[PDB]
Amino acid sequence: SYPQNCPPDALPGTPGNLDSAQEKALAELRKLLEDAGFIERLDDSTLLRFLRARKFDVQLAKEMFENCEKWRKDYGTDTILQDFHYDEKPLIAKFYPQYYHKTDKDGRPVYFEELGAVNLHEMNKVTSEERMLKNLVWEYESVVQYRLPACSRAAGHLVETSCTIMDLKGISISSAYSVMSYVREASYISQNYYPERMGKFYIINAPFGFSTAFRLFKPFLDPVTVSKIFILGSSYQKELLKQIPAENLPVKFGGKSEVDESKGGLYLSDIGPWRDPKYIGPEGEAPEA
Numbered sequence: 448s449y450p451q452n453c454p455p456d457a458l459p460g461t462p463g464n465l466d467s468a469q470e471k472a473l474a475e476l477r478k479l480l481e482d483a484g485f486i487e488r489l490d491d492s493t494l495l496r497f498l499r500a501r502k503f504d505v506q507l508a509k510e511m512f513e514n515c516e517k518w519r520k521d522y523g524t525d526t527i528l529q530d531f532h533y534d535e536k537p538l539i540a541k542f543y544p545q546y547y548h549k550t551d552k553d554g555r556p557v558y559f560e561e562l563g564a565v566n567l568h569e570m571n572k573v574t575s576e577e578r579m580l581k582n583l584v585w586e587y588e589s590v591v592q593y594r595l596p597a598c599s600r601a602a603g604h605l606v607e608t609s610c611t612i613m614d615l616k617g618i619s620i621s622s623a624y625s626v627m628s629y630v631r632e633a634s635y636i637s638q639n640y641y642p643e644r645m646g647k648f649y650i651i652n653a654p655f656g657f658s659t660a661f662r663l664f665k666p667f668l669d670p671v672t673v674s675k676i677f678i679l680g681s682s683y684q685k686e687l688l689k690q691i692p693a694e695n696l697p698v699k700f701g702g703k704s705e706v707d708e709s710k711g712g713l714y715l716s717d718i719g720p721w722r723d724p725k726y727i728g729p730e731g732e733a734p735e736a
């Protein structure tokens with residue numbers, strides 16, 4: 448168990464903040480699904496996320512959920528946490544940092560990626576696209592099962608979304624052509640299978656003409672997705688501190704938070720309430736390496 452209701456000042460159609468019509472829509476969809484033979488992921492949070500993804504259209508949300516359930520069983524997502532071994536992670540992480548550090552003002556996990564060293568040919572030597580997306584699915588289920596529950600216990604309310612920061616420092620804009628396929632697949636996964644899991648998505652240190660580049664990706668992205676994405680130049684600090692306390696924001700990004708050499712520095716640690724024994728529960732500590 449952990450807090451299951453969003454704060455009351457959150458949007459409607461989120462748990463704890465339903466009107467009678469949203470209520471009836473949730474009970475209807477739940478009954479449809481129970482009739483279909485489903486069992487897992489009939490909790491308020493999940494179903495309201497699919498409803499919200501379809502503006503509370505019951506038949507459309509049901510179709511969404513059913514396709515997602517189908518893909519979970521086709522991809523083997525339900526055991527992926529125990530059946531995927533991303534052994535090449537220490538290699539890829541040196542091109543492509545992907546880490547967490549603490550929480551935002553609403554309790555969301557803060558997730559970071561740095562793209563300035565990503566080189567496609569090198570990682571092509573290290574891995575395949577299919578495995579990188581297996582790892583993406585793996586990190587989604589991991590944040591769901593470990594990070595979000597602890598985050599919810601720490602905030603005192605439900606937390607179901609991430610605060611993501613993606614640093615473009617040092618990318619070459621001409622590189623974007625090379626990753627559309629990957630982005631198309633990643634976004635396809637995030638939108639159809641993890642709906643309503645984005646919270647805020649900053650893009651910092653963006654180089655000039657990047658707003659032009661991002662156009663190549665826009666035909667992949669839901670409008671709800673694009674409304675979450677906030678593109679910034681090198682003046683990102685004030686904006687980040689609006690959303691994350693300085694104590695929780697790494698020093699390289701304008702805040703005051705630090706990680707020691709001992710603990711693996713910023714990249715290799717995984718500091719946050721999902722590491723705190725006060726806030727870990729029946730799910731245990733997140734896998735860590």
Ligand SMILES: CCCCCCCC/C=C\CCCCCCCC(=O)O[C@@H](COC(=O)CCCCCCCCCCCCCCC)COP(=O)([O-])OCC[N+](C)(C)C
Pocket residue numbers: 558562563564565566567570571572574575576577579583586587588590609610611615617618619622623626629630633634635637644645646647648664668672
């Ligand atoms: C060799 C093998 C294959 C090769 C693959 C190589 C590709 C690798 C390289 C780079 C990958 C870059 C894109 C990755 C997409 C990340 C999105 C994501 O996580 O999903 C988000 C959906 O959000 C979207 O759908 C929006 C994505 C658009 C922004 C990306 C364009 C910037 C690229 C600039 C171009 C620079 C080019 C660089 C060159 C100097 C969800 O966000 P969230 O909920 O906050 O996150 C969930 C948290 N979790 C995931 C931890 C669970």
